[PDB]
Amino acid sequence: AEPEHDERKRLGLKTVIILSSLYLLSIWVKKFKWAGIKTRKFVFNPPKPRK
């Protein structure tokens, strides 16, 4: 019914390894280049009362 079990599992192991590596890589880079936007702080100073 499925004459590809060994090859399927080998290819699947390689694929899950490479996608796990890529996923962790994307995690690190997203946490990296969003660091400059996830930490910016705002300070509100009320303006002088004159339109």
């Binding site: 280049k33 400059g36 936007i37 910016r40």
Partner: protein, 431 residues
């Protein structure tokens, strides 16, 4: 013209020039806005205003002389201009002002008047002058938590938290005999060389300037003052520069001069210069250029400034300027270097040749407080001619290719990409 040096407890300098006939003598202190904690910010400005406020009547009444001042980052200078034949009077007044006695100059009413005047002046500066505001904000954001970022005029809240104790403490801790010189620019030959050094005619309080725990730093921080009421948008960029007394000062100055300045509303400025001017003239993007290469005793700041009526075109202007900076470090024609060298020769000649004794005194004190003697103009021209394409390319590759940058802005800054798009445009392009 020539430079002289000597020292006994203090330092005395003189650059005689018989052509001019406006002798100016004054002291210069190597401690200004860079030697004051953020909780004590406007003490130097209060000193400047309190010496420019009340005795300015006495100087014009008893004698004739116009007294000036200047604080830039650390060079608290008090120049006393005069006529060629009346320098001893200026020196005597300076002695009776600083060394003894400052108690009369420090009164409640006089200090209150100076305080309110300084508050009004700093408020007016913070309201109107936009390019200077963005420059000070660039300084305050490039040197976060470092005694080089706080402004030179004093933050508004910092003024009203110091009256007489902080001012006298600064006087007793910085107005010393270790970081003081006595310039003599004008047309005086040897009276300055002898009268400055005397048995007791020198500043009191022998001692040493307090040491600084932190030297300097540079981190890529962004600051925005978005407000849509203003008509224009002023933005500035910067990178790490070099301090004084480094073998990269003039190379950095030449790199700044390569792109130069620009002004769209002048017929003589739209037809010269280098490529980015041509790339910009096709669509009306910007109005002003200021490629500046500032240097201080700790660290420098080689940057860029502009101002645009157009608000949608900010991104294109920034991208074109960054692309030109990128092109600077890979391919510059020898003609560009030759033209920049000639232009810088002319610029330094105008800067160091102006007939104002006060400016020459400021430059002399600035260059003598770090090295020991002024670097003469002929040697400067020779070492400018020594520069070549290899040196400027090496410096650009070292200090510009993929380096941390600081940004500032105010006005209509809705169309400015924040930090990653600007930073990425220095190395993502094909090289």
């Amino acid at each position: 013209a020539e430079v002289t040096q000597l020292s006994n407890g203090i330092v005395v300098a003189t650059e005689h020039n018989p052509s001019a006939h406006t002798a100016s003598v004054g002291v210069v202190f190597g401690s200004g806005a860079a030697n004051e904690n953020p909780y004590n910010n406007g003490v130097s400005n209060l000193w400047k205003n309190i010496f420019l406020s009340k005795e300015n009547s006495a100087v014009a009444a008893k004698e004739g002389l116009a007294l000036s001042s200047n604080i830039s980052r650390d060079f608290q200078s008090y120049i006393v201009s005069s006529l060629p034949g009346s320098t001893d009077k200026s020196l005597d007044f300076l002695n009776q002002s600083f060394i003894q006695q400052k108690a009369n100059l420090l009164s409640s009413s006089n200090f209150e008047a100076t305080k309110k005047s300084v508050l009004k002046q700093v408020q007016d500066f913070e309201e109107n002058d936009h390019p200077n505001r963005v420059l000070e904000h660039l300084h305050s954001t490039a040197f976060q938590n470092t005694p080089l970022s706080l402004p030179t005029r004093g933050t508004l809240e910092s003024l009203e938290n110091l009256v007489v104790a902080d001012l006298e403490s600064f006087a007793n801790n910085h107005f010393l005999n270790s970081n003081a010189v006595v310039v003599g620019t004008g047309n005086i030959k040897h009276e300055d060389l002898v009268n400055s050094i005397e048995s007791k005619n020198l500043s009191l309080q022998t001692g040493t300037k307090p040491v600084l725990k932190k030297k300097a730093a540079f981190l890529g921080s962004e600051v925005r003052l978005r407000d849509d009421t203003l008509p224009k948008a002023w933005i500035s960029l910067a990178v790490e520069g070099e301090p004084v007394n480094s073998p990269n000062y003039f190379v950095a100055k030449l790199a700044a001069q390569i792109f130069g300045s620009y002004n769209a509303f002048e017929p003589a400025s739209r037809l010269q210069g280098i490529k980015l001017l041509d790339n910009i003239q096709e669509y009306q993007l910007c109005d002003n250029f200021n490629h500046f290469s500032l240097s201080y005793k700790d660290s420098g700041l080689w940057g860029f400034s502009t101002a645009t009526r157009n608000v949608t075109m900010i991104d294109d202007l920034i991208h074109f300027t960054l692309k030109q900076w990128n092109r600077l470090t890979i391919s510059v024609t020898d003609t560009e270097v030759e033209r920049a060298k000639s232009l810088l020769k002319l610029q330094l000649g105008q800067l160091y040749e102006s007939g104002n004794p006060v400016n020459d005194a400021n430059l002399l004190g600035a260059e003598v407080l770090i090295k020991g003697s002024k670097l003469s103009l002929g040697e400067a021209f020779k070492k400018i001619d020594a520069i070549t394409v290899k040196d400027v390319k090496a410096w650009a590759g070292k200090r510009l290719w993929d380096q941390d940058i600081a940004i500032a802005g105010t006005g209509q800054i809705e169309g400015l990409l924040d930090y990653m798009r600007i930073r990425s445009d220095m190395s993502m392009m094909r090289w």
